[PDB]
Structure 1
Amino acid sequence: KAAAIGIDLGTTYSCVGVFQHGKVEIIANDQGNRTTPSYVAFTDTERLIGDAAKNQVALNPQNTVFDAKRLIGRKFGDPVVQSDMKHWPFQVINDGDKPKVQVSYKGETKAFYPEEISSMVLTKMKEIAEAYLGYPVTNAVITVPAYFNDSQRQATKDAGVIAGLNVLRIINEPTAAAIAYGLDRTGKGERNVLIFDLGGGTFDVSILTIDDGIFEVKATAGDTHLGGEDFDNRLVNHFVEEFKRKHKKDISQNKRAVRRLRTACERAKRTLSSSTQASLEIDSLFEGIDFYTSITRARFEELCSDLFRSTLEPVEKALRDAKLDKAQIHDLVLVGGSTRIPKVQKLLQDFFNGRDLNKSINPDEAVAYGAAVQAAILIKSTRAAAS
């Protein structure tokens, strides 16, 4: 039979779902993870995609590519492109005003278009889904941010085609989230939805009006450089400082020690979303000194207090652009793992005067969930048109 997948092709991570037997299934990668890093590493012997690629990033920063979504469908002259480049460890070259990522692969200089890199992350998703199902899967719905332009949408589709997928539809990330919560099935009238998407490196606020199951993007706001990784950095600086206080040694200049500490802060942070305390357990952090310490939710919330506050401004702007009051938003949808942070949920909840938030579906997987729902609907429709 004709099966179809839903793929959330995220900036930092990608997720893949399939609607089957009246239920959505989010497919774990061979490593068992329900999301896969949007990383592509070129080494001296092989092309690594997903976790394997991310794991060796410290070791091979120059030829490990991430953030291709920042560059997809963009011109090389784009201001965003020019700014973003200064912060990447891999080379970006200009070809016909089209950005290309130049790396070292099997001892040779090779350049790739952003859609080529994305096509590789989509192949990993196409494969992950085929490993689960037991047969090849090509029909797919791929999601993109609502603000994405036509050039950006075509490049994402181009990546899907290169990856060997028949792209059923390119649908907006916030639309997919609403679909996941079946907000396009509440019947007649207008339904105002606000999507609060906080990722690892981007923040997106989207307001949609769903009238008779039809979706309209009323406003889009956010920070392209704000997310989970900033909270991580706040923890890193707190702990670099703590180390100095405890041992009178500055570990900041040691690339390995700060990377190992960053890794530990990202894990401690996650633990904090579900518990009051989190303990770091780093063996021989710097100069053979183990770093076994603890942090509290309260202290973490303090180290990030201003950052959490900033999320609300984008929300206020979206309300103005959409010409709506706080009371006019029917549903609040959380997307992105960072929305698991209780302070963030509390801040959003307080802003909307105690309104319950849609958070039952995993925030990390809501988009892939909605995309898998749409893929099934479209595949059925395309097939039903045939016979």
Structure 2
Amino acid sequence: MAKAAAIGIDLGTTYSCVGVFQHGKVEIIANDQGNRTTPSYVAFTDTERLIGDAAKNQVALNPQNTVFDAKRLIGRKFGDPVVQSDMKHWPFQVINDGDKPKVQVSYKGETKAFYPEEISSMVLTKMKEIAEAYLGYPVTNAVITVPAYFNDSQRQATKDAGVIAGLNVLRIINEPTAAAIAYGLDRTGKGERNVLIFDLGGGTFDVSILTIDDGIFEVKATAGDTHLGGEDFDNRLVNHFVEEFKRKHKKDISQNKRAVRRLRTACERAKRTLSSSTQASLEIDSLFEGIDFYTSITRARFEELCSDLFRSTLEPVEKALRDAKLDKAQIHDLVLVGGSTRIPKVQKLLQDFFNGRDLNKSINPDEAVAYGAAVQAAILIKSTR
């Protein structure tokens, strides 16, 4: 029953996703708001702890006590220059507990501090409860994914987050490996198969090259930009619309925190529409000083606004190929991961770089990792019996 069942969890930097492999198919499980992915956010309020959508939905009202990006801290020492650099950009406090970072917040009127693995365990507990509500019984066996570049300390702290969350961690697997499993790229028989995973998420960009030799995965190269993602594209749209508001009304809105946030969420929505329509409409009632902001933007203008950022995704692709010592024609498969890979210009740039090659994109790119983890969790629990 429950003991013969296992889930696959993609514990992402900005969003998490849970899947289950049963009756010959993967089911990506929708949360209680009907969303197939859940924000990796934890909010501490005057009455409760919120996780996911409810936590992301109140971030503007409570920024000091809304934790996100715990994955950037997990398994790291406080003195790590990655931690010291990131801390300057977060509205929540990060403290030092014997060279270990803790996020410090106000919860039910009291000061509380949490280890990154404790924050990530709250996200994991939510994914576990989302699976349980779908299945009708508690599932505790899980495969959790991590970036291919995570070291032993980061992998161990992720497993620790799983244990705190009440999960039996069957295995910690690499995100690009789970994506290759999702597409069945490890079941092509004999011979070395070279796979490139192009993973453009909400806040990070990862390029991974894997060799699959008779079911055995080997990481040949990892490249990317830990501070490049979908939110930089939302921000480029924001600056455009702030300048358009100034041209139409002779008013600078950039200082009004509420106006900028409402514009930001509307820009994120319009960006998604631009992946399947050649125009998107913004409809903001009373954006600033009672002025409605009803406008539109073409996909051509959005592509211009992010042109330099889209083009920059090809430098880590070339870097990974040189590190792996492979030419473009030596790569057998190209896999898309992350919601931002739905952007047509991004697909076109990658396909043209690989000389007109087909891309593996039929599985929802923001779900491909959880899909593969779910497949592996099923194989692993069946072998355990």
Cα distance in structure 2, aligned partners of 1:357 and 1:292: 36
What stretches of structure 1 move > 3 A for 4+ residues in a row?
A: none
Task: Show the 5 A alignment for 1:60-139.
Answer: 60-139=62-141
Task: Supply the RMSD in Å over aligned alpha carbons.
Answer: 0.4
| Whole-angstrom distance in 2 between the partners of 1:338 and 1:165 | 30
Residue deviations 1:208-234, cap 9 Å, x none? 000001100000000000000000000
* Residue aligned with 1:281, SS: strand
Q: In the aligned structure 2, how far is the partner of 1:74 from the partner of 1:311?
A: 27
By how many angstroms is 1:13 displaced?
A: 0.1
Name the count of aligned residue pairs.
383
Counterpart in 1 of 2:334?
332
Distance 2:274 2:190 in 1: 41
- TM-score normalised according to structure 1 size: 0.99
Aligned-partner SS, 2:34: coil
Residues 337-348 of structure 1 aligned to structure 2 (within 5 Å): 337-348=339-350
Give the superposition deviation at 1:139. Answer: 0.1
Shift of 1:2: 1.2
Deviations for 1:334-379, whole angstroms, at most 9, x for unmatched residues? Answer: 0000000000000000000000000000000000000000000000
Give CA-to-partner distance per residue, 1:100-129, whole Å, 9 cap, x none: 000000000000000000000000000000
* 5+ long unaligned stretches in structure 1: none
Q: Which residue of 1 aligns with 2:26?
A: 24
Q: Distance in 1 between matches of 2:276 and 2:377?
A: 33
Residue-by-residue CA offset, 1:28-73 (whole Å, 9 max, x unaligned): 0000000000000000000000000000000000000000000000
TM-fit CA distance, 1:264:
0.3
Give distance in 2, aligned partners of 1:27 and 1:75.
34
5 Å-filtered alignment, 1:36-75, equals 36-75=38-77
Q: Pick the aligned partner of 2:307 from 297, 305, 308.
A: 305
Residue-by-residue CA offset, 1:282-307 (whole Å, 9 max, x unaligned): 01000000000000000000000000
Q: Structure 2: any 5+ residue segments left out of the alignment?
A: none
Q: Which whole-Å CA distance do the structure 1 matches of 2:277 and 2:353 have between them?
A: 24
TM-score (norm 2): 0.99
1:182 corresponds, among 163, 166, 184, to 184
Q: Deviations over 1:175-197 (max 9, x none)?
A: 00000000000110000000000
* Whole-angstrom CA distance in 2 between matches of 1:59 and 1:374: 40
Matched, 1:357 2:324: no
1:167 aligns with 2:166: no
Tell me how far apart the structure 1 counterparts of residues 372 and 237 of structure 2 sit (CA, whole Å).
Answer: 33
Q: Distance in 1 between matches of 2:154 and 2:9?
A: 16
**Cα deviation code 1:308-350 (max 9, x no counterpart):** 0000000000000000000000000000000000000000000
- Aligned mates of 1:16, 1:368 — CA distance in 2: 6
CA distance in 2, matches of 1:78, 1:186: 41
Mapped to 1, the partners of 2:356 and 2:370 lie a distance apart of 28
In structure 1, how many angstroms separate the alpha carbons of the residues matched to 2:287 and 2:315? 38
2:366 is paired with a residue whose SS is coil
Residue 62 of structure 1 aligns to a residue whose secondary structure is helix
Secondary structure of 1:274 counterpart:
coil
Q: Deviations along 1:8-41, whole A, 9 cap, x unmatched?
A: 0000000000000000000000000000000000
Aligned partners of 1:299, 1:175: CA distance in 2, in Å? 36
Distance 1:275 1:228 in 2: 18
Matched position secondary structure for 1:170: strand
Aligned to 1:252: 254
Q: Deviations over 1:124-158 (max 9, x none)?
A: 00000000000001000000000000000000000
Output the CA distance in 1 between the equivalents of 2:165 and 2:353.
Answer: 43
Matched with 1:33 is: 35
Helix, strand or coil for the counterpart of 1:241?
A: helix
Cα distance between partner residues in 1 of 2:115 and 2:261: 29
Q: Determine the C-alpha separation between the residues in 2 that align with 1:329 and 1:336.
A: 20
C-alpha distance in 1 between matches for 2:166 and 2:262: 37
In structure 2, what is the Cα distance between the partners aligned to 1:193 and 1:281? 42
CA distance in 2, matches of 1:267, 1:78: 35
Secondary structure, aligned partner of 2:274 = helix
Could you say what secondary structure the match of 2:139 adopts? coil
Deviations 1:226-245 (A, max 9, x none): 00000000000000000000
Give 1:262 deviation, angstroms: 0.1
Q: State the identity as a percent.
A: 100
What is the alpha-carbon distance in structure 2 between the residues aligned to residue 96 and residue 298 of structure 1? Answer: 51
